[PDB]
Design a protein around this ligand. Structure first.
Ligand SMILES: NC(=O)C1=CN([C@@H]2O[C@H](COP(=O)(O)OP(=O)(O)OC[C@H]3O[C@@H](n4cnc5c(N)ncnc54)[C@H](OP(=O)(O)O)[C@@H]3O)[C@@H](O)[C@H]2O)C=CC1
Ligand SMILES: CC1(C)N=C(N)N=C(N)N1OCCCOc1ccc(Br)cc1
Length: 159
């Protein structure tokens, strides 16, 4: 089982300037709850973007994809190919744009957080993968974050 988990603006934007262009602490808790105790896979850029206090993310086996054979990621398993990364039975791909696109075909689940923020795509942005008709989904109720932004959760699947 390979799953993808991400938070996106309605526009599809998930990253800009090496960051996540919004604040939504409630999403942090959701991400943690889904991924806790499992293997997580991320691209090297996503690894770099992790705040040092949570690098590596606790209680999870951190796997980092990089083309540099000798890249140093303390507390994480550096692998050079997708096949080396997706070996665990329950793997959660946690970003970024390049890795989501790379792992989507191996995925049978997507846990998505839509953030109701006006944020038109700009060149160079990290973007969420687009889910086609092979996916069946359930949409949750809109909720207000203490940061003022509305957000809702989607759970997609395919067999
Ligand atoms: N909103 C959300 O849910 C999330 C948003 N983000 C945001 O996404 C952005 C980062 O995304 P993005 O730039 O797309 O980067 P990625 O996180 O997807 O990392 C890309 C890197 O992964 C490695 N890589 C990619 N393909 C391969 C391959 N086929 N084999 C080996 N290594 C490979 C490379 O490492 P190298 O260059 O070392 O070879 C590459 O530079 C940031 O802005 C971040 O904040 C990240 C996660 C979640
Ligand atoms: C966007 C986020 C978090 N939430 C969803 N639903 N899915 C993601 N893949 N997540 O990104 C994971 C990589 C960055 O996560 C962290 C974790 C803790 C801190 Br502190 C800062 C960043």
């Amino acid at each position: 089982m390979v799953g993808l988990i991400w938070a996106q603006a309605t526009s599809g934007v998930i990253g800009r300037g090496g960051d996540i262009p919004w604040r939504l602490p409630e999403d942090q808790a959701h991400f943690r709850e889904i991924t806790m105790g499992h293997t997580i896979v991320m691209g090297r850029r996503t690894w770099d973007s992790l705040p040092a206090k949570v690098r590596p993310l606790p209680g999870r086996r951190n796997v980092v994809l990089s083309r540099q054979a000798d890249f140093m990621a303390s507390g994480a398993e550096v692998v050079g190919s997708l096949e080396e990364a997706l070996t665990s039975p329950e793997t959660w791909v946690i970003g970024g744009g390049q890795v989501y696109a790379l792992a989507l075909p191996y995925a049978t689940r997507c846990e998505v957080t839509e953030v109701d923020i006006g944020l038109p795509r700009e060149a160079g942005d990290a973007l969420a993968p687009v889910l086609d008709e092979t996916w069946r989904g359930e949409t949750g109720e809109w909720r207000f974050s203490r940061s003022g932004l509305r957000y809702r959760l989607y759970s997609y699947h395919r067999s």
